[PDB]
Amino acid sequence: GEFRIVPTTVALTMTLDKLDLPIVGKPTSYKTLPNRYKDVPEIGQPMEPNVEAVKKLKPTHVLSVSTIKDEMQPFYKQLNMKGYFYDFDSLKGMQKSITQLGDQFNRKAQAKELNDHLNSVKQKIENKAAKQKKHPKVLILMGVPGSYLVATDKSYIGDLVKIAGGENVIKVKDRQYISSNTENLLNINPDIILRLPHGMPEEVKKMFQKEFKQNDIWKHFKAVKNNHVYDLEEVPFGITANVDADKAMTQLYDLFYK
């Protein structure tokens, strides 16, 4: 009858806190987790939780996200439990996931409240963006340890850019993040370049720093010449949606129009 839930991602953990739910394990993260989970044990990093540690807690439900569904299949196999891959790649997707979590875990009122808040902020920002005369063309880079990718409309940051009134210069939509070389970056004309870090932020920012100094293509971008290359904080600007999308939407709108 009772649920023993283990969220494997920081976004899921913060979502279950907004839903007023207890959990039995939590991800290993450098990020701030809700205070109420201070004492629950860590189960390893989101992308590779410890199979042995998760089993130990006798969970009823182990939760993951759409963004890494394929890379998580072996984990769930070894766990020998049902895969849960909540869509956290857009506001609409996360809204659906929140409703689903509310239904699964008897938190329908709490889910509706959070969804209503996020919907209200989204609508308000989209309303403001509609009234803007100009809309920046935007290139979004997602830096990970060793390399950087380009974010599409299918990624959370892509959705945020769209909501805030930006036009993503990357038009391909079949995956969330694409290689630095999938679309050619000489064929785009962005007003704004956004750089988001992941996994190892310190290493990523010095990597972006060195890339922009050493790869000749960047000096020629007008966003670079006009000082509109922005390094975004991984919190609220992460690799998936999170319940602090209200802050992310508001902050991005304010960066675009100031």
Ligand code: HEM
């Ligand atoms: C390139 C090598 C990569 C490395 C070494 C890496 C490493 C990490 C690390 C260290 C974390 C935990 C950060 C924390 O302490 O909270 C994390 C989280 C995560 N990563 Fe990556 N990452 C990489 C690329 C990617 C890519 C390409 C994706 C998929 C688009 C991805 C998806 C995720 C997701 C969904 C989480 C959980 C986010 C959350 O906790 O809400 N990672 N990764």
